[PDB]
Amino acid sequence: YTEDSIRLYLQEIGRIRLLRADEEIELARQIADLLALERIRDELLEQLDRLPSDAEWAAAVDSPLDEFRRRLFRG
DNA sequence: TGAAAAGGTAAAGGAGGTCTTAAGCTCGGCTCAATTTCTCTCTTTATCCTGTTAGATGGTT
């Protein structure tokens, strides 16, 4: 039960293991997928002048709402 | 009826206000160089935004 705040942040950091290069490549692919999906949604926002619903966004990707949502989560 | 006793009138003179000029000034207008604002352009910075590919991976006092 330390009072220092920086040391607590450093401990919280140390509870996470460094990535490996293959892990970086794998995560980078999912990040790119998320970015493209976000760009599409942004297009729906311009078309709808409102936030698209997950169903409309899933419809914009021709994807089942479950599959789409899980892909979004992974990203 | 005579006689105070007050009340008038017509002057002279003064006191006071109101007019007239010779001397001088200074004051505004008029011109006319001689310039400070103003308002456009025409730039020229002042400020903000985005990106950067060797590898790096837990503090100092």
From Swiss-Prot:
Coiled-coil region: none
Subcellular location, record wording: Cytoplasm
Domain of life, source organism: Bacteria
Record's function text: Sigma factors are initiation factors that promote the attachment of RNA polymerase to specific initiation sites and are then released. This sigma factor is the primary sigma factor during exponential growth.
Quaternary organization: Interacts transiently with the RNA polymerase catalytic core.
Stated family: Belongs to the sigma-70 factor family. RpoD/SigA subfamily.
Name of the featured protein: RNA polymerase sigma factor SigA1
Annotated source species: Synechococcus elongatus (strain ATCC 33912 / PCC 7942 / FACHB-805)
Gene name of the encoded protein: sigA1
